[PDB]
Amino acid sequence: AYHIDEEVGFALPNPQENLPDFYNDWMFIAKHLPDLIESGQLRERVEKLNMLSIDHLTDHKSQRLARLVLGCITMAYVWGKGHGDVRKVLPRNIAVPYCQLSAALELPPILVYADCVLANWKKKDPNKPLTYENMDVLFSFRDGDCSKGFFLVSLLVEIAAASAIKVIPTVFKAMQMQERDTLLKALLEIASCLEKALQVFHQIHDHVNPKAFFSVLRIYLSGWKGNPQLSDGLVYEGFWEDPKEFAGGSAGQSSVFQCFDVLLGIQQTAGGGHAAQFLQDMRRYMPPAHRNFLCSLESNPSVREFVLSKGDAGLREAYDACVKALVSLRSYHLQIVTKYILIPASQGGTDLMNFLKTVRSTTEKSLLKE
Ligand code: HEM
Ligand SMILES: NS(=O)(=O)NCCNc1nonc1/C(=N/O)Nc1ccc(F)c(Br)c1
């Protein structure tokens, strides 16, 4: 189908953690980024790799892991240590397989949300549940970067939203088959799961430290689109002749908030303003199956139209509980961007907050009763 798992939602079910032995020189660099970066051997070990054919990768999970491996190497190669000493050219022996692999997975050749979160995890013990304490990340950039906390908490917000996403078939079939009671329970279960996803979101304080995120990790997730340090983008040597620009990572790339915008008929990506264009641009950084899923929902009959047309105050309350849990998520998110970015910035990015406030505002405008 749309590669949406019932238990983990948009996340890659049970990611592969090991590559064929043919790729150990890739794997060795990725597993050792904190040391190799700290000493300054990282760029040297990248520039000495042979060119490895990607054709020994033979399933979606092996290719997803290879993309995560090459994507971490690329960020560590471009940004190095984080203090302005960048590289504007990606060596051929990594750029070519990376770009080839990315074309096959239909992703931009830059680290995205779906690599470093949705494929970058493992259970400690496969027979115990998906709790923080039973999980680990597969790669990190620097000692102290809080990558495990940041990646795993984002992942756990995705798994919470999965119990909501599981209900979306029920919504459209209760509409088609005119089943009012069924549609009302469905919307109320969605709001319930959206409310639990927000409480899982509070665990970002438990595991991520603002100074670590702002001054270490944020750097390795940054991109080269409208970035003054790489004003023309990145040359992917041996693959494209001219430098290319791509945006850095963001859970704007998470389909979960865009999922429920489309479902509830909230008019985010409709218009020509800068908030709509960004949200549609971020859809090019999502896995193709998830891109197609969001478009498939966009073409179905409106859930908002249905509830608005049937003079049914219980239905309207259920829809509003959904819009409200969405508004709560984005407001808490505003808070998070204040604690983890704006405050540490002071120790131009005011278009950041104007974007997020416009999206939250548009969301709360869809409420049926103020
Ligand atoms: C330290 C933690 C986080 C920070 C600092 C942060 C920051 C940001 C920033 C700066 C943007 C603007 C997009 C851009 O300029 O690239 C953004 C957008 C977004 N973020 Fe986060 N984020 C964090 C965690 C999360 C988590 C855990 C989620 C949900 C799983 C999330 C969901 C979203 C979404 C959906 C958008 C797009 C705007 C919208 O749909 O309302 N973020 N975030
Ligand atoms: N250079 S900048 O302004 O600070 N970049 C801001 C873009 N937002 C983010 N930066 O860093 N994580 C971001 C973000 N926002 O929702 N979510 C986020 C969460 C987990 C991930 F693995 C990735 Br990749 C992105």
Side-chain angles (χ1 to χ4, degrees):
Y2 294 95
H3 280 95
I4 286 165
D5 184 79
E6 165 191 3
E7 183 186 15
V8 301
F10 289 122
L12 187 58
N14 176 65
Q16 186 113 60
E17 42 195 303
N18 270 289
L19 281 183
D21 280 290
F22 187 75
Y23 300 101
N24 293 4
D25 295 336
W26 292 359
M27 193 60 65
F28 177 84
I29 297 179
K31 288 288 184 196
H32 294 94
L33 295 182
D35 321 84
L36 291 168
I37 291 171
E38 192 58 53
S39 61
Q41 272 308 97
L42 174 127
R43 289 163 165 186
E44 170 164 331
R45 310 267 332 260
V46 170
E47 291 150 359
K48 295 221 285 202
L49 295 159
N50 329 293
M51 159 104 79
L52 299 179
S53 174
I54 61 172
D55 274 300
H56 288 67
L57 309 146
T58 54
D59 41 320
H60 185 74
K61 296 207 187 165
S62 267
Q63 293 172 308
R64 282 298 281 288
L65 174 57
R67 220 193 102 76
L68 165 61
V69 167
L70 302 172
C72 293
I73 292 159
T74 294
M75 312 311 285
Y77 187 88
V78 165
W79 300 120
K81 253 176 178 157
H83 309 298
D85 176 34
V86 306
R87 290 297 185 267
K88 312 197 163 42
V89 181
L90 190 57
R92 155 154 209 287
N93 286 354
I94 205 92
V96 166
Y98 189 30
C99 285
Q100 287 172 351
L101 196 52
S102 297
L105 290 165
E106 307 181 59
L107 287 168
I110 189 181
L111 189 68
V112 300
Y113 183 79
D115 307 304
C116 58
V117 165
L118 308 162
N120 181 25
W121 65 279
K122 49 169 293 162
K123 287 179 148 169
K124 260 139 180 197
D125 170 20
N127 280 124
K128 298 175 97 75
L130 296 157
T131 71
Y132 184 92
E133 290 78 26
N134 194 33
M135 300 166 89
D136 224 315
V137 294
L138 307 183
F139 311 88
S140 292
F141 290 101
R142 308 285 293 278
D143 293 319
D145 59 6
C146 295
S147 62
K148 180 204 192 177
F150 185 60
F151 293 150
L152 281 188
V153 166
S154 293
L155 173 62
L156 284 164
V157 162
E158 288 279 328
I159 293 161
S163 40
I165 301 150
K166 171 177 40 152
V167 172
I168 295 184
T170 306
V171 169
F172 288 104
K173 298 318 290 225
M175 271 167 77
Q176 176 196 281
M177 311 276 81
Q178 292 283 336
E179 205 85 40
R180 180 263 190 191
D181 288 353
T182 287
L183 172 50
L184 194 162
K185 327 264 187 174
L187 286 178
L188 287 187
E189 167 77 358
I190 289 192
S192 183
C193 299
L194 287 192
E195 282 148 21
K196 157 71 155 267
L198 154 72
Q199 305 287 120
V200 174
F201 205 157
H202 294 358
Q203 300 170 42
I204 180 171
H205 301 294
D206 296 339
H207 305 285
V208 185
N209 154 275
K211 324 278 267 303
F213 172 82
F214 180 64
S215 63
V216 181
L217 191 67
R218 179 189 57 90
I219 271 62
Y220 293 108
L221 306 180
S222 292
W224 29 94
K225 188 164 152 308
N227 188 322
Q229 312 212 99
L230 293 187
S231 34
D232 305 329
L234 190 55
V235 169
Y236 295 79
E237 180 184 67
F239 200 84
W240 299 305
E241 179 137 5
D242 288 3
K244 276 212 182 325
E245 294 197 323
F246 297 105
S250 148
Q253 302 169 355
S254 163
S255 318
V256 153
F257 291 25
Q258 288 202 40
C259 180
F260 302 100
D261 275 340
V262 176
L263 188 71
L264 302 166
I266 293 141
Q267 320 82 350
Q268 289 295 358
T269 54
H274 292 84
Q277 193 160 312
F278 182 96
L279 280 205
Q280 155 61 231
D281 182 46
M282 275 323 93
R283 280 169 125 168
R284 317 156 46 181
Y285 296 70
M286 310 178 179
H290 300 169
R291 225 179 299 129
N292 299 330
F293 175 78
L294 285 191
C295 275
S296 147
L297 292 185
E298 209 134 37
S299 70
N300 291 342
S302 174
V303 174
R304 183 201 178 64
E305 228 293 312
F306 188 93
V307 166
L308 261 179
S309 79
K310 295 212 134 197
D312 183 329
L315 261 193
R316 287 190 321 254
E317 257 187 53
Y319 172 97
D320 264 3
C322 287
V323 178
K324 287 206 239 58
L326 245 176
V327 178
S328 313
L329 273 157
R330 293 186 152 124
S331 285
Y332 189 78
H333 188 256
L334 271 298
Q335 281 225 247
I336 288 301
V337 173
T338 294
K339 198 204 175 202
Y340 284 80
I341 292 193
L342 285 193
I343 293 182
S346 58
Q347 317 187 147
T350 189
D351 324 313
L352 171 53
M353 302 278 306
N354 287 347
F355 167 65
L356 302 185
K357 289 186 237 280
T358 298
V359 167
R360 168 189 60 185
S361 167
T362 296
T363 303
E364 58 196 349
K365 284 208 232 192
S366 299
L367 276 174
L368 302 188
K369 178 253 250 175
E370 310 182 292

